[PDB]
Structure of 5-hydroxytryptamine receptor 2A,Soluble cytochrome b562:
Amino acid sequence: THLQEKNWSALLTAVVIILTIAGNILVIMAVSLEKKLQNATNYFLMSLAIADMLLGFLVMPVSMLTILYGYRWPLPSKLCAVWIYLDVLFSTAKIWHLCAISLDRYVAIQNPIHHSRFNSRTKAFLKIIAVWTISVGISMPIPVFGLQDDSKVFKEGSCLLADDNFVLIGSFVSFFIPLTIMVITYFLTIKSLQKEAADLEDNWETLNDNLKVIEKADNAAQVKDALTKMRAAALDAGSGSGDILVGQIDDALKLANEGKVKEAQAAAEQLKTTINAYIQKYGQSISNEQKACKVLGIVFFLFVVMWCPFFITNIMAVICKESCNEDVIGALLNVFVWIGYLSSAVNPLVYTLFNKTYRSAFSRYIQCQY
Ligand SMILES: CC(C)CCC[C@@H](C)[C@H]1CC[C@H]2[C@@H]3CC=C4C[C@@H](O)CC[C@]4(C)[C@H]3CC[C@]12C
Ligand SMILES: CN(C)CCOC1=Cc2ccccc2Sc2ccc(Cl)cc21
Ligand SMILES: [Zn+2]
């Protein structure tokens, strides 16, 4: 029965490993091939996928091997610190990539021309490298104090974080703080997007009012005034996209400057439909931003929820070092770490479920259609 349980646990963990590897390889392929997904957010998501693939290649199979050997470290003792370091490094890179995505998208939408078509690809790669560097800096104390002292990474022959200060500082620096920052940034982001939609409605109101004023105008001065208001409104409502709409308003304005009232009014009549179409397009862009915000919130929520039992049990075990049952806590950790690895695997499934570009790319990759 003991062998039965360890063999089925190892098999389930192997299923989790293969799902992780396949899904994250597919995500890497989709981001590197599909030209629609060439923004900074998808670059960060591919970095996340690479981190998950490294976690499934370097950490999860060694964890399965540890399971097979009754949780006694089979490899040399110096490799336990390296294993814990790689695990912590990849998980910290994941969580801080999510936090960086949140902050970056928020600060981005805080920019009046952030619907422009000029987004720098190189800067995203630089930010990703900086996040990897700060993750390495966060994780380095674990090898530092683990290669010197074997007691902080070993507990009765098993390989796991044993230092209480290590567990506390790690749980705060790599889990709690980014979680709080992400929650706050998420709510601030929904507020900014609401403000964006409100301003868009305001610009549409201005465009409609002045269109009617143009429809019933006597002289060129009235037409020019209404067109000036319209131009400012349309420029603000483009939010940086760079449209023909302001140029067409400038054409009408030029007509009005020449004292040609009837022709300016005809130009405005033409402008009505163009204005409606472009306003609808701008609101669609805002809605797309909202949908991306919700999808990334789903991803962050899944990661946090699926890792929370492990961190809760770890903090609890550090609090009641001898008051609580350590065997049951050991089993709880041995299950919750794999729950967190399942979180590491789940993300490509979400990308498929809620992103049509990813879904079509994956459907074509499964059938080897490149
Ligand atoms: C193309 C873009 C989006 C993805 C780039 C991924 C790069 C920057 C990431 C993915 C895997 C990362 C590596 C993962 C493991 C290690 C070993 C560690 O001891 C030092 C950091 C180092 C070497 C990381 C450096 C940064 C790294 C190479
Ligand atoms: C050997 N393996 C099990 C270590 C993995 O534990 C951790 C995972 C993580 C998961 C998700 C985000 C961040 C981490 S950073 C971390 C920090 C402190 C401790 Cl105590 C654990 C810990
Ligand atoms: Zn926007």
